[model samples]
Target: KLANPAPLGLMGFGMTTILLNLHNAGFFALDGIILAMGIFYGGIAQIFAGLLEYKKGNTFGLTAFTSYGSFWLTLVAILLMPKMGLTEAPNAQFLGAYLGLWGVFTLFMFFGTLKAARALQFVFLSLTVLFALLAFGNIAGNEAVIHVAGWIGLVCGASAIYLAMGEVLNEQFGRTILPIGE
Candidate 1:
């Protein structure tokens, strides 16, 4: 139904994150393509979905989705600002610290998922790891660690996509097509 906003939010995040991690894996550079996906689908759409969740009285959904949406916008802005000379790019260590903060936040979110579906918990856990790895990688200038995080991101995003579709299909069919363990 048109009212189910979770799929829109999850799909937007999953698709854009996949592209981001692919680039992080060194498959491509951060250009117009990735930024556009980050800004529009990953950033704005999730914010809308989160706002809808607020009306639904789903606090976790509102927090998680909105936070992630803001994360994308902030991320893209951090990269974009430097190019325009509107602001200077922070050093790698500072970037590491910023990502580290997200990792901590994600860990808290992961704990919150303890009562949710297994797939959802898995996503949060993987995301936490991804952020931790990325933070450390950037700080150390370690390409290998970052590459490993990219693989983790791929699985994380893919699982999110699966969960999104599973929720939609199951709801539409009035049955469980995908078993998201309780």
Candidate 2:
């Protein structure tokens, strides 16, 4: 039986991004809940989806899902290792550069989405903005930039969820229940 793994990867990314942005937005403190989701849902689940995508020979899906899964795992480690005395916390400037690198990566990925669904293009575009804002916030120590980045992340995550649902519904119903504008 053929099954699409895109929804799983998207949902994993969506849920984890939303939770982390909530903390970034100062709605709550960073805690176990977000870390746990990062490890399991965002990291492991996306990795699994990436492996499945590989089976289907979808290079883009494999790259996006696996890289982002590793990103989630590395992010969690960055947050937790310092507290555990296993490593030092990254300085703001270093973290800024790290986020900037991811932004660069996402910007290229956004280009890849130009020929894809409109929903996907939007997700990548917004995600690029989100990462840039986050990098700027960290580098400049600007809380306002971080806050705006969090809101942008909300839009990115919600868009991913919408795309996932749209794909699922459209396939299951054999009709465009939710248009992805492909």
TM-scores for candidates 1 onward, in order? 0.96, 0.97
RMSD of each: 1.3, 0.9
Best by TM-score: 2
lDDT per residue for candidate 1 within 27-135, as digits (tens), equals 9887888799889989999889888897788899999999998999999999999999899987899999999999999999999999999989998999999999999
Q: Model 2, 24: alpha-carbon shift in Å?
A: 1.2
Candidate 1, TM-score vs. the true structure? Answer: 0.96
Please report, as a residue range, the 10-residue window in candidate 2 with the lowest summed lDDT.
49-58
lDDT of 2 by residue, 13-106 (tens): 9999999999888899989999999999989999998889977888999999999999999899999999999999789989999999999999
The lDDT for every candidate, in the order shown, is 0.90, 0.93
For model 2, the stretches where C-alpha displacement exceeds 4 angstroms are: none
